[PDB]
């Protein structure tokens, strides 16, 4: 591409995920592809184990598995770290604490390659409960959190978001999910430090009736929001 930063998100632009996890003494992998528009803060994905049956709830990897796609309202642009170290992208990395459980450590690498955007992410869990809400499968496909809130960290020229999911779980109870995040470009131009701000997530999870892979398909609409 010529296009730099913003630039590059002003039309519908193809995704590809690639997930390789590790979690319980289980290997897996997952891909994905779709499509994100930004304009409109859109994002629809379907999701595929390619190791077979994944050994944990598909809803649990949703935040894992490219917050560039948020739509930015014109008065906040100036706000929006994701797209600026575009094209050469940005690391993300996390850790997902689930409460009176294990943990998730994710590390990401989202750029393009050529007109795609890509996110390769590597996952290990640590120290879940065999008998617990994820390694039991107990969770319910669904969604229900919404934000993440946004700080700039300008020593390291990037951002860091902290947010709670709430997973439900089949009995009634909920599994709680701390989510600690830090994103650094990738290369050496400069980005968009933002002031305080969140973003808002909408979603719906569901299934593709004529895949028989282990799989997910999602729909996400994502806008910031916080500052006036």
């Known amino acids: 591409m010529v296009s730099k930063g913003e630039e590059l998100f ?3 632009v193809p995704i590809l995920v690639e997930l390789d996890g590790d979690v319980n003494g289980h290997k897996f992998s997952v891909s994905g592809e779709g499509e994100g528009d930004a304009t409109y803060g859109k994002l629809t994905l379907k999701f595929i184990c390619t190791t077979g049956k994944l050994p944990v ?3 649990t990897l949703v935040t ?3 917050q560039c796609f948020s739509r930015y309202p014109d008065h906040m642009k100036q706000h929006d770290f994701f797209k600026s170290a575009m ?3 940005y690391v993300q990395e996390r850790t997902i604490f689930f409460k009176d459980d294990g943990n998730y450590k994710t ?3 989202v750029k393009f390659e050529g007109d795609t955007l890509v996110n390769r992410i590597e996952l290990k869990g640590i120290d879940f409960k065999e008998d617990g809400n994820i390694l039991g499968h107990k969770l319910e496909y669904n969604y229900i959190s919404h934000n993440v809130y ?3 960290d300008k020593q390291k020229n990037g951002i860091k978001a902290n947010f709670k999911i709430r997973h439900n779980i089949e009995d009634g109870s909920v599994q709680l999910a701390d989510h600690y995040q830090q994103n650094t470009p990738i290369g050496d131009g400069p980005v968009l ?3 305080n701000h969140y973003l808002s997530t909408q979603s719906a999870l569901s299934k593709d009736p004529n895949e028989k892979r282990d799989h997910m398909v999602l729909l996400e609409f994502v806008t910031a929001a916080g500052i006036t």
Do not use: S
């Open 193 to 195: 430090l933002p002031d």
């Open 57 to 59: 709830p598909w809803p």
């Open 150 to 152: 946004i700080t700039a």
């Open 64 to 66: 894992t598995l490219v």
């Open 10 to 12: 002003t039309g519908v």
């Open 107 to 109: 590390r990401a690498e």
């Open 87 to 89: 094209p050469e992208g």
